[PDB]
């Protein structure tokens, strides 16, 4: 409800089908997420793969979010002053792909997923801006 207001904020402009605030530093778990999305089901294992030391493996093997197979388009998670990743869901059964942006603050990750046709650029700006705001607030 407190962190849910942040999810609501991320969703308010109509471009995202889901969003989430996800702890990674003190412990790895979802703090808040859109009900019924993949982010809600993100596991500690999946968080570890997002934040982990290995920044090359997920370009060969992909990764999952809430067990949904994804590819990594760009990794700047440990580029200071950026701290984002651009991800895209894999298409199964003829379905659209969706762009996902991740912004990393000090304690949490900001996840957003676009609706069909929503470009990664605006999504990245949204995750970055929220992550930056949280970082400047000590989170």
């Amino acid at each position: 409800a407190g962190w849910q207001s942040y999810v609501d904020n991320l969703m308010c402009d109509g471009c995202c089908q889901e969003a989430a605030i996800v702890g990674y530093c003190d412990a790895k778990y979802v703090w808040a997420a859109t009900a019924g999305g993949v982010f809600q089901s993100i596991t500690p294992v999946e968080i570890d793969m997002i934040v982990g030391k290995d920044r090359e493996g997920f370009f060969t093997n992909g990764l999952t979010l809430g067990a949904k197979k994804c590819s990594v388009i760009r990794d700047s998670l440990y580029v200071d002053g950026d701290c984002t990743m651009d991800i895209r869901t894999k298409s199964q059964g003829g379905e659209p792909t969706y762009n996902v942006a991740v912004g990393r603050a000090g304690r949490v990750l900001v996840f957003v997923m676009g609706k069909e046709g929503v470009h990664g650029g605006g999504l990245n700006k949204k995750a970055y801006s929220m992550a930056k705001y949280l970082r400047d607030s000590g989170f």
């Binding site: 942040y6 308010c12 703090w31």
Partner: peptide
Amino acid sequence: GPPPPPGPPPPPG
């Protein structure tokens, strides 16, 4: 559950 947020999120666009 997690620590509460530091305050409200930024104003919506």
